[PDB]
Design a protein around this ligand. Structure first.
Ligand SMILES: *[C@@H]1O[C@H](CO)[C@@H](O)[C@H](O)[C@H]1NC(C)=O
Ligand SMILES: CC(=O)OCC[N+](C)(C)C
Lengths: 109, 100, 47, 55, 109, 47
């Protein structure tokens, strides 16, 4: 849709939006990240090397005041999908991983 | 997925037609989990499944259509260890607690 | 006149105002029908 | 050389050479590609996993 | 914050900072790099091929005189995060490595 | 006067009209003499 692509261009414009900066206002306020793990499958437990392999969906929820818009100006659009590689993310990682793979596997919208 | 990639990673070229049709046929190696029943091994029959779907678009935004029920085997390289008895895709819908 | 030059013009026009991050529907209430099929090249391994 | 770099800049100029487009002429004519495999080394045949490796 | 965006854009402004130049003043002065390895875990010792695998943090500290600012001109900010790809780095790596892997894993901020 | 400003000027001047795809010889008939050598750090394996 023309409205949708106008909105997406507006939101992700690198001129006005810098994805390397934490979306904090008022100076020293903090960003709250809600975390919830959903276990899809316990793939294996390797006793010899002491590794547990899991297929999980890691829910992450937070606020970004720079990614707001007025629905009335954009055809009453309430939500949109944005590529997670082009917005600010809190770098929440599996800290006690084995094999040094900290990040998620897919990087969905 | 189990010990592999979740999405396609090769990213071949798409074939775009003038009326707006887009045909994209990339290769993929998948490592999927399937429960294995060895009651009658080595005369056993295994039934391993593969579930595909859009991750972030619900039915109102993206819907899937079976191109054809049976999996295509016109270019299949015979294994010599296993023979495919039946390979069919089933369309399903459902709700998750994640999303409304 | 050469097919390559015409294709160059077509590529210049097609991607002029194109957004790869937006669902490609004329109307928001429209749904993108994706025809999906599988073709198996080989059965590498049953572990 | 100055002449060589002038030529290479002219040939690959993205303003007038798009590498995404088949070098097709005469409309529906096709590009002919000649192929020839030269074998330098038969590195190994792995019978167990049924793979041949070559250079 | 907008002040942090302004500061980040001011520090990495290419007209006044390029990472290809060592930050040495006074002619032939040298940059002093402080190294400290912290051990996350000793993953394994493979005696057969004589290889030790470790997870570590390669702490590195140095002074770059080109990345200075006055806090009172930026809402009293005392420190900021810059991507390590965009600043001059000392290319400190492991020489006795096996498998030919020299550099650090992620190139964090 | 500082070394950094001189180095910045030099970098600007060296790559103003530099083409990395062209063999760097003043004359076409010239040969590029490459001095080649090896330094072994370790013999990892003999399989
Ligand atoms: C294989 O499993 C699927 C899903 O559980 C089921 O629909 C199908 O009938 C099974 N086939 C056989 C031969 O058991
Ligand atoms: C919105 C979103 O990311 O959903 C992911 C989970 N899924 C595929 C079960 C809906």
């Amino acid at each position: 849709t023309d409205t949708e692509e106008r909105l997406v261009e507006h939101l992700l414009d690198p001129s006005r939006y810098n994805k390397l900066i934490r979306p904090a206002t008022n100076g020293s306020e903090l960003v709250t990240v809600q975390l919830m793990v959903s276990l899809a499958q316990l793939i294996s437990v390797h006793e010899r090397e002491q590794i547990m392999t899991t297929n999980v969906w890691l829910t992450q929820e937070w606020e970004d005041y720079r990614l707001t818009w007025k629905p009335e100006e954009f055809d009453n659009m309430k939500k949109v999908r944005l590529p997670s590689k082009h917005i600010w993310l809190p770098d929440v990682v599996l800290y006690n991983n084995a094999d040094g793979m900290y990040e998620v596997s897919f990087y969905s919208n | 997925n189990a010990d592999g990639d979740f999405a396609v990673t090769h990213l071949t070229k798409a074939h775009l037609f003038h009326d707006g049709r887009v045909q994209w046929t990339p290769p993929a190696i998948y490592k999927s989990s399937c429960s294995i029943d060895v009651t009658f091994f080595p005369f056993d029959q295994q039934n391993c499944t593969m579930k595909f779907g859009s991750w972030t678009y619900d039915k109102a935004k993206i819907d899937l259509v079976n191109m054809h029920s049976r999996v295509d085997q016109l270019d299949f390289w015979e294994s010599g260890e296993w023979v495919i008895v039946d390979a069919v895709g089933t369309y399903n819908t459902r709700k998750y607690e994640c999303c409304a | 006149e050469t097919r390559a030059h015409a294709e160059e013009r077509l590529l210049k026009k097609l991607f002029s105002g194109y957004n790869k991050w937006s669902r490609p529907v004329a109307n928001i209430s429209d749904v993108v029908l994706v025809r999906f099929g599988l073709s198996i090249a080989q059965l590498i391994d049953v572990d």
